[PDB]
Amino acid sequence: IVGGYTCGANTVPYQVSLNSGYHFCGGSLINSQWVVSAAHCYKSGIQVRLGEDNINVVEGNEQFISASKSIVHPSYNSNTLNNDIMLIKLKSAASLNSRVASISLPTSCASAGTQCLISGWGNTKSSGTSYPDVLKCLKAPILSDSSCKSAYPGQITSNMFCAGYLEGGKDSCQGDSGGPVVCSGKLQGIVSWGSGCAQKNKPGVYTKVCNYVSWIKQTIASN
Numbered sequence: 228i229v230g231g232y233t234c235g236a237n238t239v240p241y242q243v244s245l246n247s248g249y250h251f252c253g254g255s256l257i258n259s260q261w262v263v264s265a266a267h268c269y270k271s272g273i274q275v276r277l278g279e280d281n282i283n284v285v286e287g288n289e290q291f292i293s294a295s296k297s298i299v300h301p302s303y304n305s306n307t308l309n310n311d312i313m314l315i316k317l318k319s320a321a322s323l324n325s326r327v328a329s330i331s332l333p334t335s336c337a338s339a340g341t342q343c344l345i346s347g348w349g350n351t352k353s354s355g356t357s358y359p360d361v362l363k364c365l366k367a368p369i370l371s372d373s374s375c376k377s378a379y380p381g382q383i384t385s386n387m388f389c390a391g392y393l394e395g396g397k398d399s400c401q402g403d404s405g406g407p408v409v410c411s412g413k414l415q416g417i418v419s420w421g422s423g424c425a426q427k428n429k430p431g432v433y434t435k436v437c438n439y440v441s442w443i444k445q446t447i448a449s450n
């Protein structure tokens with residue numbers, strides 16, 4: 228997260244870190260057994276780390292639980308990043324408490340202008356490289372579909388939205404991939420892509436979660 232702020236330990240209780248020997252992506256806990264992330268985060272040997280603040284220090288609220296299965300969206304295209312969404316099932320159910328909690332799925336899509344909270348452990352620099360140890364947060368508005376398409380001609384599908392600031396300086400970044408965009412207590416987005424980070428006229432692009440609620444629910448119901 229570039230141009231954000233320190234969230235505060237366990238203030239974003241649905242935020243997970245995906246670990247394969249090191250943090251490599253974020254995710255969102257949606258019930259005791261399931262995490263939503265980006266399909267471009269797919270790999271084998273995932274351990275889900277819940278209750279994290281400093282990802283390099285055991286601070287006392289963590290739950291580390293291996294993934295038992297991952298399900299990439301059937302229509303995910305890794306070239307265009309269309310349908311950039313994946314479900315991960317935990318080998319055992321998380322113990323839910325104030326610091327480890329699920330986030331609600333939307334019942335309707337969010338509109339341009341809605342303020343959302345975007346979070347993760349990704350790069351904090353738009354030029355150089357600096358990875359934080361503690362969870363970073365950014366408050367950002369959803370942008371109109373027209374401004375999103377204008378920023379990225381030929382690249383924005385109906386399964387994507389933009390959020391952030393056309394002026395630049397404030398954005399998600401590499402390492403935030405797969406993490407949450409939460410608006411009025413609903414998971415509306417997943418950190419998906421952008422051109423660099425926090426560049427002028429290049430806002431963050433996010434998977435449009437409201438399009439996938441039916442798929443998420445039916446997948447969970449049979450797996």
Ligand SMILES: N=C(N)c1ccc(/C=N/NC(=O)c2cccnc2)cc1
Nearest residue numbers: 399400401419420421423424431432
């Ligand atoms: N500006 C954003 N909101 C943004 C931009 C990019 C990304 C994702 N990056 N992933 C990578 O580059 C990458 C991925 C694999 C290997 N090497 C590099 C997320 C958000």
Ligand SMILES: [Ca+2]
Nearest residue numbers: 281284285286
């Ligand atoms: Ca920790």
